[PDB]
Amino acid sequence: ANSTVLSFCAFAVDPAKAYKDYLASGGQPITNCVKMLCTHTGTGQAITVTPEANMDQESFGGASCCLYCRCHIDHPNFCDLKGKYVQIPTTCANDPVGFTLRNTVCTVCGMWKGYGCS
Amino acid sequence: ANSTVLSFCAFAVDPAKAYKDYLASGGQPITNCVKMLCTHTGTGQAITVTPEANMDQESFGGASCCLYCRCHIDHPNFCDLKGKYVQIPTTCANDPVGFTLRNTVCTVCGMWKGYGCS
Amino acid sequence: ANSTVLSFCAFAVDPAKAYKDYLASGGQPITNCVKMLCTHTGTGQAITVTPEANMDQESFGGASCCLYCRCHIDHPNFCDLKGKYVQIPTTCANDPVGFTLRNTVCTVCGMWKGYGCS
Amino acid sequence: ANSTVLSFCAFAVDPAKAYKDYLASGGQPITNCVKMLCTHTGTGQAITVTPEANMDQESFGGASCCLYCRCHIDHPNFCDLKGKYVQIPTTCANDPVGFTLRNTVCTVCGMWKGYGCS
Amino acid sequence: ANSTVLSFCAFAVDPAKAYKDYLASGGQPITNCVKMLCTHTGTGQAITVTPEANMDQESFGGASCCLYCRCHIDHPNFCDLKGKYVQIPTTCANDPVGFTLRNTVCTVCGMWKGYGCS
Amino acid sequence: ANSTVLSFCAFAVDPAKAYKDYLASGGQPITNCVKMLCTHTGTGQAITVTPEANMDQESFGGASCCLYCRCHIDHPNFCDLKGKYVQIPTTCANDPVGFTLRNTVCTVCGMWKGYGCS
Amino acid sequence: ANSTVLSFCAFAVDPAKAYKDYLASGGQPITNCVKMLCTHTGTGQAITVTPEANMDQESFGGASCCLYCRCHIDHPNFCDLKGKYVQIPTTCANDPVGFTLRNTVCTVCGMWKGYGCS
Amino acid sequence: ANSTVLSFCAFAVDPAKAYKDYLASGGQPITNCVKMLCTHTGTGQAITVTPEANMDQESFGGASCCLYCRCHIDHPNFCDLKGKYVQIPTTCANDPVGFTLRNTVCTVCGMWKGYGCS
Amino acid sequence: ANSTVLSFCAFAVDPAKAYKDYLASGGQPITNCVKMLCTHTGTGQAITVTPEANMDQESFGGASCCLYCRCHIDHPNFCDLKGKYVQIPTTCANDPVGFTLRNTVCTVCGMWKGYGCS
Amino acid sequence: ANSTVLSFCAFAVDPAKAYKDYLASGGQPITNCVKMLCTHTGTGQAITVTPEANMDQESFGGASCCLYCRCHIDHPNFCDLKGKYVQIPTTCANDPVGFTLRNTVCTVCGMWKGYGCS
Amino acid sequence: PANSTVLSFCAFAVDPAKAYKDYLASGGQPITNCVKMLCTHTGTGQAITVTPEANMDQESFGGASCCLYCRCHIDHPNFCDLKGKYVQIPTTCANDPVGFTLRNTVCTVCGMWKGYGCS
Amino acid sequence: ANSTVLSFCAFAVDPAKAYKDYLASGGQPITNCVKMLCTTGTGQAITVTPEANMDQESFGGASCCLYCRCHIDHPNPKGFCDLKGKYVQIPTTCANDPVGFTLRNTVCTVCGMWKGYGCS
Ligand SMILES: [Zn+2]
Ligand SMILES: [Zn+2]
Ligand SMILES: [Zn+2]
Ligand SMILES: [Zn+2]
Ligand SMILES: [Zn+2]
Ligand SMILES: [Zn+2]
Ligand SMILES: [Zn+2]
Ligand SMILES: [Zn+2]
Ligand SMILES: [Zn+2]
Ligand SMILES: [Zn+2]
Ligand SMILES: [Zn+2]
Ligand SMILES: [Zn+2]
Ligand SMILES: [Zn+2]
Ligand SMILES: [Zn+2]
Ligand SMILES: [Zn+2]
Ligand SMILES: [Zn+2]
Ligand SMILES: [Zn+2]
Ligand SMILES: [Zn+2]
Ligand SMILES: [Zn+2]
Ligand SMILES: [Zn+2]
Ligand SMILES: [Zn+2]
Ligand SMILES: [Zn+2]
Ligand SMILES: [Zn+2]
Ligand SMILES: [Zn+2]
Secondary structure (H helix, E strand, O other), X not given: OHHHHHHHHHHOOOHHHHHHHHHHOOOOOOOOXXXXXXXXXXXXXXXXXXXXXXXXXXXXXXXXXXXXXHHOOOOXXXXXXXXXXXXXXXXXXXXXXXXXXXXXXXXXXXXXXXOOOO | OHHHHHHHHHOOOOHHHHHHHHHHOOOOOOOOOOEEOOOOXXXXXXXXXXXXXXXXEEEEEHHHHOHHHHOOOOOOOOOOOOOOXXXXXXXXXXXXXXXXXXXXXXXXXXXXXOEEOO | XXXXXXXXXXXXXXXXXXXXXXXOOOOOOOOOOXXXXXXXXXXXXXXXXXOXXXXXXXXXXXXXXXXXXXXXXXXXXXXXXXXXXXXXXXXXOOOHHHHHHHOOEOOOOOOEXXXXXX | OHHHHHHHHHOOOOHHHHHHHHHHOOOOOOOOOOEEOOOOOOOOOXXXXXXXXXXXXXXXXXXXXXXXXXXXXXXXXOOOOOOOEEEEEHHHOOOHHHHHHHOOXXXXXXXXXXXXXX | OHHHHHXXXXXXXXXXXXXXXXXXXXXXXXXXXXXXXXXXXXXXXXXXXXXXXXXXXXXXEHHHHOHHHHOOOOOOOOOXXXXXXXXXXXXXXXXXXXXXXXXXXXXXXXXXXXXXXX | OHHHHHHHHHOOOOXXXXXXXXXXXXXXXXXXXXXXXXXXXXXXXXXXXXXXXXXXXXXXXXXXXXXXXXXXXXXOXXXXXXXXXXXXXXXXXXOHHHHHHHOOEOOOOOOEOXXXXX | OHHHHHHHHHHXXXXXXXXXXXXXXXXXXXXXXXXXXXXXXXXXXXXXXXXXXXXXXXXXXXXHXXXXXXXXXXXXXOOOOOOOEEEEEHHHOOOHHHHHHHOOEOOOOOOEXXXXXX | OHHHHHXXXXXXXXHHHHHHHHHXXXXXXXXXXXXXXXXXXXXXXXXXXXXXXXXXXXXXXXXHHOHHHHHOOOOOOOOOOOOOEEXXXXXXXXXXXXXXXXXXXXXXXXXXXXXXXX | OHHHHHHHHHOOOOHHHHHHHHHHOOOOOOOOOOEEOOOOOOOOXXXXXXXXXXXXXXXXXXXXXXXXXXXXXXXOOOOOOOOOEEEEEHHHOOOHHHHHHHOOEOOOOOOEOOOOOO | OHHHHHXXXXXXXXXXXXXXXXXXXXXXXXXXXXXXXXXXXXXXXOEEOOOOOOOOEEEXXXXXXXXXXXXXXXXXXXXXXXXOEEEEEHHHOOOXXXXXXXXXXXXXXXXXXXXXXX | OOHHHHHHHHHHOOOHHHHHHHHXXXXXXXOOOOOEEOOOOOOOOOOEEOOOOOOOOEEEEEHHHHOHHXXXXXXXXXXXXXXXXXXXXXXXXXXXXHHHHHHOOEOOOXXXXXXXXXX | OHHHHHHHHHOOOOHHHHHHHHHHOOOOOOOOXXXXXXXXXXXXXXXXXXXXXXXXXXXXXXXXXXXXXXXXXXXXXXXXXXXXXXXXXXXXXHOOOHHXXXXXXXXXXXXXXXXXXXXX
């Protein structure tokens, strides 16, 4: 499943939009991101140097979520995710990749705009 | 003409301010940016991996607008423009190099603050 | 479609050959090659640092026609097209990617052999 | 004093959180940041390519204040400070390193949030 | 915390030996290693590109364990752990760093000699 | 042919595991591995700087056999094969890519464990 | 044999010219160029990404024929041979190194000028 | 002198054409290229690894004639002149820079097309 | 005045000589070299890792004074001034760029010859 | 003597084999490897970060032993010896460059198989 | 160990070298564990060389083991203009190699230590 | 000739010394150093442009960097072989052996000229 999806997006002139369109067609989210095991809740920050999932999130290994790293192609913006950990609201933890693609980290508090910001 | 302006800004201890003051004295906007021939049905985002100009914008070539890339010098952010496409509000496509400098991209929208944002 | 073709050529031992075979079987050429907005009174040369299309050509962004560049793989000849602009005969413009693969630039006049040369 | 603190934060899994706790527990701010000798008539923006302190600020050599550059370790995000100059409210010029970690630069204003912004 | 131990070793002319000697003297093992969720019984191999823990092991993040990566110093061998995932026996898992150091991976089995091999 | 398979592995989170399963499901082995013209009087060592096939082996160009170099993706461990030559037991020469993946090169004899060591 | 000639060439101010003069002094050609086991039904072009020899040529591992790659020195070309395969007229397979040095690939058809061209 | 012209061309979106129009207007050619003392006489090739001047040519330092090199900007071609020696027809030794730009080296004999080829 | 001078010296075959001549014609020295506000309790050495000015000198940011760094071009010798701090005799603080060009650091005491040496 | 051998092996398609055949023909071992003046109280491991020789060994500088490093050519393993120290049984210390080529380190105990191992 | 304390100190100092200087000035113990070479001791006697060149009045140490910066795992201000090379040191000062290379200079003419060889 | 000498130094543990004894044994100096065609220069030992004077020859920097001729890394106190890309002025009376001349001489840090040939 992931190969068809990742293949389709990898060669599209715009990977991000290929995925977006794909999901909009009812396509299945990219699975197999790595979930981090935490013994304590963290700051709840979007992207961090160490796992920081709080009561409402889950922490995945950065690269594991970066679509470009997953598609093995160059970056738009290096995975400003690679080597770090991404916190995702649990309600959206079903599509980590798509999530970071569709959201914005707050520059002030550093949490997802719309989910735990301000 | 471009050479006189760019030569001027290129050796300034602060290029951006140089161009800013240059224009402030009635100077003429740097020209020769490359315009993309698109359908104008884009997302309207400020900076994108492919032309995404809507009906009130023009799509220029990244490097064409990055002052530093034009001055062949280092950056103070790499041409977060280079290799991408900048959408500029039609009413401001007479000074692309200047537009990007003067304006901010809404981190939430992806659109230019004050021109499309919200 | 594009992904389909691009994927097939991407992993073939000889990408260029796979695209030729593909075409020779009536496959649709690769699309989404960005086109430049230029005067059309250029030198008409095959590959240039700024759009140089004459009346019988179309200018495209070099990278968007570089099959390797498109596929995200190394090169045979980096593809001498990236960062430059390719001028293509309007009649052949319907397949930029293949056109550059099947043709040759004159070392002497810099135009496509058979479409501008001598 | 400085070496004790820096050593402690460097080998931490999260240097920023370490330093933050060190201070919280009544630790003395990292000293030895280089202060620039300016006119104090500058724009007053947070991080600039040339000293821009105003009357209520002090200008420091970027690197001097980047905790990561002081610890000799890789970076989160290189020192988006290395090479630039950091303007800091005089009331806070006693802990430049920590000030830049606790505060955020307005992407529109270019000035410190809560310290000049808007 | 872990920083006093890491500081010692980082400046030793032989970190690996320093940490061993440290532990020998009753020193506390280095903590703060990251664990990941293994999606259904792994092969049990010691070092993999994806979590691969057995029902007897736990999967830690490579770099998180490589002592040289924790001490921010170059390597002997780079972190044939970095970017990968290290599987460690649950009952030896209180000292991830030490374990990888004290043990050898079978070049045949791919499992730890003494803990899985043959 | 190879594109379907290769495309399927390149995007899996564990290419090797994927190719393995593919083969398990009866999939056809990857082909088109450049085969060398040797005398078959060589050392008979697994991986070497020049073709060294003995009477029981065939020689191939390293890269034609490294799944990673064939999928145009990065390496776990560069192709310990790239640039060198891989000796493959003739009976197993119909699946060179797979062979190198399942076998272990003896640190002493220098030959594949089970197919020529001791 | 080879060590003597290559050593001689490698330090000359013009390695190519040195080999040429050598040969003309009745010098023995450089031997030990990897020979490919090919179908002998290839396009027949000079330098290819895969063995393309025809019924009148042999296919050698490029790098084994690049004098500079053989002398371990820099290039005046970058071994547009290294990594590729060189098809050489069987009646000349006795001096693959010298052939490429002496001959020229036609830019239009890609075949050795005067050995298959036009 | 040379600064007025080199600066002018340096910032032009098409440096080559700039120097061309400059000359077309009676502008003085870029001077100050280094001349190599080529006692005896070389092969007469256009671009060589050591001076090869004829009775009818002068040998200049590769860099000295590389417009991009003399301008300190990137290239459309490093310039294949740098570290090389260029042989130019005595009658044209008054504008080395512009010469290389206006002329072409024969791929077969290595000599300037029109000025030595055949 | 800076961009005019820098421009002139940047395209000269010898920046340093060009600036020297520029000065000998009553040309105004390059300005805008950042200075450090220190305690003037330094060793008074020529080039240091931290401000070391004594009562008779000013401390400048190395890069501000490295003519090439200011001219944005390669270097004869790695700006040995870049990242460092240059001490300059007060009575010469009016032409920092030039000072470092005209003077030499004693290899024994690390001070400017004829300004604190021996 | 050294330069002859090294030169001989340097240009060999298979250097290691070349040096082997050289020795086998009663050739004199490469000399001038650097011995470490240490107290022979080390762990006696094959390759280490600090001299580790025991009473029955000699410690040499890694690089001075790596044939490829002595030949200035690339590698097949880089110089997993360079920067470290190699312990060679005293009774073999007359041929350091060879001993490492001919022997294997135990992946478990870390000593030379057949000279300390187990 | 012993050196880790003094090295941890200098490493984070704004001027590592100066920090080590102050350390010794306070009676601190010189850094140890510099690797020593076994050579002819009839060498050129030059300061920094590509192969051991100690004479009868010197000792040859392994550059890197003597470059404080390389020892503190931090970037350099002078890579080690010593790394890969060998350092000849007056036998009388062989007790503090790391400090010696900091406090002394090299005859740009004779390649020998100013004060111990030159002229 | 050149190849023999260079091959000999190229693999020596100390190229500079290898060549030193080679010459000592009456060996012949390395040849083929691009001689520059120049005017009235400063006469400074190493420059970015031919700066020879009436008593020197200006050669191409690399042509004289032994290491740069043997194809091996360089010992020069951390860096680049400070000749490559530049131009070396050598006293005409010694131009018969440029490679060795630089090896045997020192450039005055103050006046930028060869110690013994123009310095002070
Ligand atoms: Zn990424
Ligand atoms: Zn917020
Ligand atoms: Zn830019
Ligand atoms: Zn918005
Ligand atoms: Zn390409
Ligand atoms: Zn033509
Ligand atoms: Zn930083
Ligand atoms: Zn604001
Ligand atoms: Zn590591
Ligand atoms: Zn096993
Ligand atoms: Zn590979
Ligand atoms: Zn074996
Ligand atoms: Zn080559
Ligand atoms: Zn042809
Ligand atoms: Zn160039
Ligand atoms: Zn011709
Ligand atoms: Zn510089
Ligand atoms: Zn002095
Ligand atoms: Zn090596
Ligand atoms: Zn063992
Ligand atoms: Zn160092
Ligand atoms: Zn002296
Ligand atoms: Zn060199
Ligand atoms: Zn002098």
